[PDB]
Amino acid sequence: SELQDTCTSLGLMLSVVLLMGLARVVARQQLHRPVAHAFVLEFLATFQLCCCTHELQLLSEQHPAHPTWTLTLVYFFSLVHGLTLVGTSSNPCGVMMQMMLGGMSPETGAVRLLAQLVSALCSRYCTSALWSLGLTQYHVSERSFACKNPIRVDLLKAVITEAVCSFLFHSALLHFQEVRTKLRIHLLAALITFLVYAGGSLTGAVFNPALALSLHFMCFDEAFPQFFIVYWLAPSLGILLMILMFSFFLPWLH
Amino acid sequence: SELQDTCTSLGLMLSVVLLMGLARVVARQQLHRPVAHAFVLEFLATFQLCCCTHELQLLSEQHPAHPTWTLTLVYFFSLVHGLTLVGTSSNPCGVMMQMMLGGMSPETGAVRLLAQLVSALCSRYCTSALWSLGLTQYHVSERSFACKNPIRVDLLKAVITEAVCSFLFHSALLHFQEVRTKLRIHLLAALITFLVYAGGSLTGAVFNPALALSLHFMCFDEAFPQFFIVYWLAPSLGILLMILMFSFFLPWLH
Amino acid sequence: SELQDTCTSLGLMLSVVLLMGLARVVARQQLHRPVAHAFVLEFLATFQLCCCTHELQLLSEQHPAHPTWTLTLVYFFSLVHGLTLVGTSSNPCGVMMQMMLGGMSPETGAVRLLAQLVSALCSRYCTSALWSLGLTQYHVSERSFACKNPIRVDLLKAVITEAVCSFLFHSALLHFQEVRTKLRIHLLAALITFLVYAGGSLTGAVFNPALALSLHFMCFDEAFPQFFIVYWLAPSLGILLMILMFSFFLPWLH
Ligand SMILES: CCCCCCCCCC
Ligand SMILES: CCCCCCCCCC
Numbered sequence A, B, C: 001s002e003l004q005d006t007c008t009s010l011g012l013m014l015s016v017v018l019l020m021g022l023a024r025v026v027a028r029q030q031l032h033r034p035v036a037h038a039f040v041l042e043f044l045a046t047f048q049l050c051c052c053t054h055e056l057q058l059l060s061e062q063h064p065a066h067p068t069w070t071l072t073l074v075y076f077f078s079l080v081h082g083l084t085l086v087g088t089s090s091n092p093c094g095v096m097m098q099m100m101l102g103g104m105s106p107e108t109g110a111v112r113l114l115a116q117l118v119s120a121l122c123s124r125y126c127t128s129a130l131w132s133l134g135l136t137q138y139h140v141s142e143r144s145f146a147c148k149n150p151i152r153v154d155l156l157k158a159v160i161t162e163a164v165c166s167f168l169f170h171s172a173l174l175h176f177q178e179v180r181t182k183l184r185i186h187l188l189a190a191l192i193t194f195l196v197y198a199g200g201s202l203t204g205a206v207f208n209p210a211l212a213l214s215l216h217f218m219c220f221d222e223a224f225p226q227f228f229i230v231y232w233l234a235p236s237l238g239i240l241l242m243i244l245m246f247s248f249f250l251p252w253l254h
């Protein structure tokens, strides 16, 4: 059973990576509107990131005796996302950073933000639509779209965790811009793995409002402000701390 | 209580970073003597590193159920030190490396070493002077300036830990000189976090004679040679191993 | 006893690094045949990597209460191998990568593969020949050349672990080619440490057919196909996945 349970989980994620890769190839051959192409690529990139993260989290909770096993898979798939999702953010907090600490206009930023939000809801539905066709034994429940409360620490602790992780990732994302592309993807994948390892036991270390929407949508519906604070406000506060540090403090300090 | 306990701890460290940042700005505007400016900046940089590390260690022991939570804060503040303390070492072992494996003259090296030692004692006093004004509930004890014996492993194990960590950090510090500044700070912050994670449970992973003086001054007074060996001799032995490896062995090997 | 037990373990590894360093220097002064020089250097590099890994694993199992202590030593010696074993692979899977995803001819690749295999068997014999002269208390058993079954996870889990680790390391090895040499060695040492930390509790995280031959030769003899699948097939499958990803998928995707 576990032989079929594990193979199906990896197979679906590799299927999704190939399926969104083909969709990117197809879109790149019949989408000559720059705004429309920006929307579709962001929709595909967010869908891949959400579905793979959904499967990775489900794999982890089915394998509690080997926490280090999923850590390598988290690194592997973070590296895969970097190599295949070039030119996208798949993160609303990343879009605010490029609009504020960068040259991204609000016109293209609004389209990317919308594409991420539609993809996050679509990824959850496809996540719920999948796992209902049979396949894995644990997929039969399909999580029953039941809130699991990813955050167990206090409200203040979770906000600090998400703000610091958002600050740590996006500052590196901003500071690795001039770095060689191949090296940068490996560095960001390593940083993502550390943040997940550091924050996964406390908050889940999402620092991604769109990804948190797909993972914990039913948690959001039950208690909106508490989840909206931890996963939408706190990561956005890490981006604001980058503005204060890298636009006001450091330029004046040096 | 824990909501006020945690907020005060972060608030003080961010206060110190801003307060030493302003002092650096003020010093940079009224200190035209190059030797005097070198002393003050090293005093401010060592004070910030000692006070933040004091608060981080105190936060960690108050939060034993979430060891990964402090790990992100350790990374965050290591990154902050790299961004704000440019041009300083805040490490006596780093000064020996620049005097020996570098062009730093003993004239400027002696001033930096003194500034670190005055700052380490001043940081401890300000650490003891603080926490006595009330503020946090656990601050009321203010650690009671009581030896906590940071090293529990055998004497040989702790010496190896401090020598290897000093070798690992300072070799990277030497080898990341040509690396882009923004990338280098992120890499050294990650390395610091690993060494603290790897060595914190055994020695504390200081590899910094000045920082160890502030953290464990009362431990030093009770048993000097044992702490002087682990925290002053062993880190200095890691620098010597770098001289043997990178000046004698490797040049002859290649 | 443990003071002598630990000092002997570090002393032998540093002795081997110096002894293979001198042999490399001697070979570089009396070997004018390029094929012969390629064989000897690969034999010396594989011997150093196998013997140090043998001692590191033996140190780790003698020190179960301080798992983080050996992690720093694993990083330290991985960094040492990078600095002293320049121009070699010490990995059969690395040789396939250079023959397939690179310009290494099969003529020089076959000599390197043979040199690794002779060294792995010679390292095991010298490992068994050593520890029989007395020295450490735990060396007296000298592991009794008894199978320890490094893999406890299921067959499917171990194959995934070795394939992913081989993919993760060798893709970074391929993508760090243009990176500065000094930075690259530090990055690969960090990646090796993570893979060992991530995979050591499940498989041992070898992703090195030659190294696995020396470590678990008696395990190989007892149950060949099961160990040949995990340590020879699975790492070679990670290299094949790199070919599919970096020669077929990514070029067509972008
Ligand atoms: C602790 C989990 C994350 C560790 C990542 C280390 C990667 C090294 C640089 C590629
Ligand atoms: C920025 C490179 C990745 C950071 C990983 C640091 C891990 C340290 C704690 C294990």
Ligand SMILES: CCCCCCCCCC
Binding pocket: B187, B190, B191, B194, C186, C187, C190, C191, C193, C194, C197
């Ligand atoms: C030099 C970059 C930081 C090194 C971190 C390695 C962590 C490996 C064990 C988790």
